[PDB]
Design an enzyme around this catalytic site. Structure first.
Site, PDB file in Angstrom:
ATOM      1  N   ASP A  48      19.933  39.577 -35.713  1.00 54.23           N
ATOM      2  CA  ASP A  48      18.933  38.713 -36.766  1.00 54.23           C
ATOM      3  C   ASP A  48      19.034  39.341 -38.114  1.00 54.23           C
ATOM      4  OD1 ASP A  48      17.139  36.978 -37.673  1.00 54.23           O
ATOM      5  OD2 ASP A  48      15.686  37.524 -36.144  1.00 54.23           O
ATOM      6  N   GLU A  80       7.779  47.475 -36.024  1.00 57.35           N
ATOM      7  CA  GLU A  80       8.058  45.869 -35.642  1.00 57.35           C
ATOM      8  C   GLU A  80       7.333  45.362 -34.418  1.00 57.35           C
ATOM      9  OE1 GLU A  80      11.848  47.705 -35.185  1.00 57.35           O
ATOM     10  OE2 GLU A  80      12.741  46.044 -35.922  1.00 57.35           O
ATOM     11  N   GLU A 122       2.579  40.362 -26.219  1.00 55.00           N
ATOM     12  CA  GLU A 122       3.205  41.624 -25.822  1.00 55.00           C
ATOM     13  C   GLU A 122       2.344  42.652 -26.204  1.00 55.00           C
ATOM     14  OE1 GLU A 122       7.640  41.351 -27.111  1.00 55.00           O
ATOM     15  OE2 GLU A 122       6.983  39.302 -27.160  1.00 55.00           O
ATOM     16  N   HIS A 136      14.565  34.942 -34.343  1.00 55.15           N
ATOM     17  CA  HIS A 136      14.265  34.700 -32.759  1.00 55.15           C
ATOM     18  C   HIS A 136      12.936  34.636 -32.421  1.00 55.15           C
ATOM     19  CE1 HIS A 136      14.342  39.345 -34.306  1.00 55.15           C
ATOM     20  NE2 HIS A 136      13.115  39.159 -33.727  1.00 55.15           N
TER      21      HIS A 136
END
Lengths: 324, 324
Positions: free
Chosen positions: A12, A104, A113, A261
């Site tokens: 990406d 990230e 998450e 993504h």
């Protein structure tokens, strides 16, 4: 643990290119500084920090992807500059305080998450006036109209509304199938012309936020309808900004920007709402962190001029990936 | 335990239709008997045994999927015949021994997800005169040629041969990268014309097999090559037979049959093997049960005339779905 997932994330260009741009363009935030890299997901950010001339970079990697980070540090001749510390950030100890933390930690609607909780937790290692890359996150919400999306949910649930599937009556489970399908956030991109109002923005300032601020996220909203129509749900995306000493670099996952993504996320209402242009849609979006490393999402909305009300309870752990 | 996955399995008409056909055509194996339904996939099989005339069906379901099953039993007016027993077959107790056990224990390559061990474990409930549906499982393997598939996996793998991806040398992880890509079994269908020899068959007889037999599965093979060319790997599929008293019904996932959600699977060699028509290709496929409810697969293949040999490790835990 998989190099294929690392590769896909490195592949990406928006993600990797924007992080690199953010670090190299703000090189004075990094030049001769001590750096913490939390959870090397694509696994490459410690190297960008070294390209900007960092003095020392502590890289905390959690999976077996920790001996792989070790191979890359050695083969790039950076053993004297990058120290790989296997384990979780909540369990390791750093030999010293850092000038800046990089990570990230963004999931599907920024929060999925729950990696942002590790990111905030790491500030125990941050010097009082250190920085963070990303520095802030903006969640945007906006109402949408999408009759096909909404309709597809019933088409699928109506499988269960047959009195003789191979001689078996399935229809008593039609209510549960409808509930289950409606509890799945939809990850997909869309045409921006489905948006019925200007988005509302909720900012998390990572420098100020505490880890506990993410267990429960209350987002009130007031939408001023630009078009008349049925509102079928809310659409979500996010921007993050790296606010350095030289410049601010933005990473956006907005439907107007190139696709990432992360795509975008839509949460459908149980029952659509009629809002004319000039009407107001107010209500609240409540994110409650759950035991499955995700969020329950509670949405309630009403057309203020009419009193007609709707809601949904979604779980971000089981999303429907609709894109191809 | 999602209704959506139930639905996806149920809507496989070849799977669902053949189970019903195996059960109704052997109605006499069910009529007035006690049945044990192990670990519902669709949840539908107890209803087929009821249609066939079973006196009593104990339906062991572990997931919250037991509540859903319970709802269908009531709405279908089968409370006197079908009894949901929540939990796992290794744990639950049953009021009595059974005449027949039914399950849908097959995954990719037949063996994936190891539902077969629970199925074999349930034999403690089986009367000596009893049966099992399915009663046998045929694994087929055949050598294949596909230059496009091989080049493509090596293409993804080649990402890591870059001496400078955003200034970073990845090339130290290139061997680790191709190895990882080549451990993924490719789940997809293919033209039958790519097969280089008649399939070899490995039969597991569920009536006779013990639970621990499935922890290690050694499959020796020797193909007589029918076309010359490069062999890029081995293709796998499976038939299962329901050996009833009235007739044997086969459920086949062969590439010569209509498509099922099992598709078929290909394990690629790290290097292709050349072989002449008439040559023999022998070796072993070895499955070892691992911690992650899956198998280590080791494949060694030799041309016997020549000594050309290619051996490969595989993990059925992260397949490549090429039918994306």
């Amino acid at each position: 643990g998989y190099l294929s997932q690392q590769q896909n994330m490195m592949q990406d260009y928006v993600r990797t290119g924007t992080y690199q741009r953010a670090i190299l363009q703000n090189h004075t935030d990094f030049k001769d500084k001590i750096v913490l890299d939390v959870g090397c997901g694509s696994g490459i950010l410690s190297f960008f920090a070294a390209q900007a001339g960092a003095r020392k970079i502590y890289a905390v990697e959690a999976s077996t992807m920790a001996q792989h980070a070790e191979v890359l540090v050695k083969s790039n001749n950076l053993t004297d500059r990058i120290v790989v510390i296997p384990g979780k950030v909540e369990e390791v100890s750093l030999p010293e305080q850092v000038d800046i933390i990089i990570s990230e930690p963004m999931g599907y609607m920024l929060f999925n998450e729950r990696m942002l909780e590790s990111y905030l937790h790491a500030k125990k290692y941050l010097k009082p006036s250190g920085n963070m890359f990303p520095t802030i996150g903006d969640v945007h919400l906006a109402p949408f109209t999408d009759e096909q999306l909404y309709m597809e949910q019933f088409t699928k649930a109506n499988f269960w509304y047959q009195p003789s599937f191979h001689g078996v009556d399935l229809s008593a489970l039609r209510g549960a199938a409808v509930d289950e399908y409606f509890r799945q956030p939809v990850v997909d991109t869309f045409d921006i012309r489905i948006l019925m109002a200007k988005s509302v923005k909720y900012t998390v300032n990572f420098l100020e936020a505490k880890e506990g601020d993410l267990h429960r996220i209350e987002i009130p909203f007031k939408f001023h309808m630009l078009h008349s129509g049925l509102v079928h749900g809310l659409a979500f995306w996010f921007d993050v900004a790296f606010i350095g000493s030289i410049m601010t670099v933005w990473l956006s996952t907005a439907p107007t920007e190139p696709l990432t993504h992360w795509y975008q996320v839509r949460c459908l209402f149980q029952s659509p709402l009629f809002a004319k242009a000039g009407d107001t849609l107010s209500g609240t979006c409540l994110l409650i962190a759950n035991k499955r490393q995700s969020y329950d999402i509670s949405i309630v909305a009403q057309v203020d001029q009419t009193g007609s009300k709707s809601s949904n309870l979604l779980d971000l752990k089981n999303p429907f990936f609709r894109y191809t």
